[PDB]
Design a protein around this ligand. Sequence first.
Ligand code: CA
Ligand code: CA
Ligand code: NA
Ligand code: NA
Length: 712
Amino acid sequence: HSSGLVPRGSHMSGSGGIERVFTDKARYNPGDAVSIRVQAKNGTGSSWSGAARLEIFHLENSVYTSSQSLSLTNGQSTTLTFTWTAPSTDFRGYFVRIDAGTLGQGATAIDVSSDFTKYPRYGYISEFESGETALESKAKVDQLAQDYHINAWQFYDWMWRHDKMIKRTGGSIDSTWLDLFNREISWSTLQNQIDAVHDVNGKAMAYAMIYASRENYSPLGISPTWGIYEDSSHTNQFDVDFGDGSTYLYMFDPQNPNWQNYIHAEYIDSINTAGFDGIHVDQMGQRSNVYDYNGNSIDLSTRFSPFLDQAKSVLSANNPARDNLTYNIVDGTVNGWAVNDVSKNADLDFLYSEIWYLSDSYNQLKNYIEQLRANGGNKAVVLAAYMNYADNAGTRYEAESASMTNVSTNTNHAGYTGSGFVDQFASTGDKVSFAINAPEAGDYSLVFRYGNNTGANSTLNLYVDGNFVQKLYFFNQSSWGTWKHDAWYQVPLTQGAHTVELRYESGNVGAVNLDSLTLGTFDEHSVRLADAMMSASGATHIELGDDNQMLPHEYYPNRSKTMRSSLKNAMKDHYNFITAYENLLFDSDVVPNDTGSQFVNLTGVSASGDGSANTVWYINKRTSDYNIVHLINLLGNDNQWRNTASQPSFQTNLPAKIYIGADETISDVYLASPDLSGGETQELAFTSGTDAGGKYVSFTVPELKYWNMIYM
Ligand SMILES: [Ca+2]
Ligand SMILES: [Ca+2]
Ligand code: NA
Ligand code: NA
């Protein structure tokens, strides 16, 4: 008479329970009513009844509890609401737990901050099509707000021209306009999205350049005498070629007051006419040997601050509620080009930096973040750091292992993957058809690795499951030995088997060598590690946008990679975590040097304090009220933040000893991890004592997967 190998009975587990827990807004003001929503589904196999219980925590302390009764027929769904009040102390993050017994558990987080610039959670919107309904604009904003607490959206490439941002014809705003790449921007869709951002208490930041006009700028009243030039005789203006012999950006002197007045009036028109909350100012990065119009040599690195101070000033005078400003410090690294002058001297509301290849290790990037924090007077730091940027990551299907019609295989150009590649793919009736599997329903990035040295674009017709989808362009390279994978199409797929086919048909031109097809996928391991390092170091990461897309590239509409459900779920936990614990992560400072011996020790694993490969990395920080120790699991992995990674070597029962100030006493030891129990703070059994090193505490860390934050 005992329980068996499995439970015996009429009830199921696994499916349903608490599906989602979220709030209507991304951010709240003190005193606000907060609607906490719980979407519940009874998949138990019979009726269910009981209490749904809410508990809210500020760090280690339970600050609110509440309960309501619930009953559901089998298969029934409902949405419950709990109403709370944002407590009076401004700038505080909270953890929210929902427990519904046998129906399961859920969690979310709440940010009470009257001004988003202290704890920005930056997302983006990069498409503005007339096909998008008001409900769909709203749905996509609501999803980012609910699932990640995004409180600011960078609206990318919304403008008509860099120097004329809203298109008017005869004083009337055009209902649609074509951007520099001939995308259709809808004025209705744009405003619907901006309103939807406002409805979740978010801010809409308008992308703009600091110093860019488009081609043919003179008729707009812009003078070439405000330009910056590659020589002292103003022969060649700095510019950007977009590769069609017509479309260009021309570059100007940010310090020139007349350029300032011109482009700032565009910034103000964008705020007032579109409803934006501020301007997200971009640049192209380091340019050496710069001259103004009159041939004087100028250091461009120090000319942004005056522009930005002036910009802030005209924004605040125009509308002090909607005057937010940031600027991209391009190519971020310690003492990098323009880093010190911008972060120290620009009147920015928070700092933003796009990281290229000057901060490749975790520790290098941590030092850059810390320099920005120190220079900027503890202003918030947001990084654009495009994950897996160079990796053709995802499930791979080799072209030569696929179904081939009127083509051949070969091995004569080195650098192919697998046994070779497809060639003689150059004439009508030629086909390659890949038999792929989608493990779950959703969007898939179809990424083709190819060669092409025919001297012009080659094209192939893409087909999915027998249906034509689009003509794809495969760009001309300098040699046939040059393999690229910048030809891609993102497509929705049902779970299961599909066919993906490239066909050379009437109207297709050129030829390609076809190496493979990859299902472009962000790698969960690297992404979770990088986000852990960034936020343990005191920064946040712009990576999510549009309809639950993740950012693969500097051109925000790029969809050459997609998140799979497992990564989406880890990002919900991560973004819950950086919201609920925002005070410990972004109010804290690094603990100085540890003269003599290091304050943190671990048993049974290699440990580093500088983000060394194949170690558990410890980071010790403090606020006035707390001592904090982050553990980031680099076991099994290198010290580089951007590239793909293996799953960390998960640890269990990791003994830890932390030294504390000898004039200090520890009542409790707390651990919180996005990886564990959805971020809920855990109270750990511990012992204290005194050693040669001083006063310490000692405890076993039950689990370390990616990132644990210990505090006391
Ligand atoms: Ca040029
Ligand atoms: Ca052929
Ligand atoms: Na949630
Ligand atoms: Na203001």
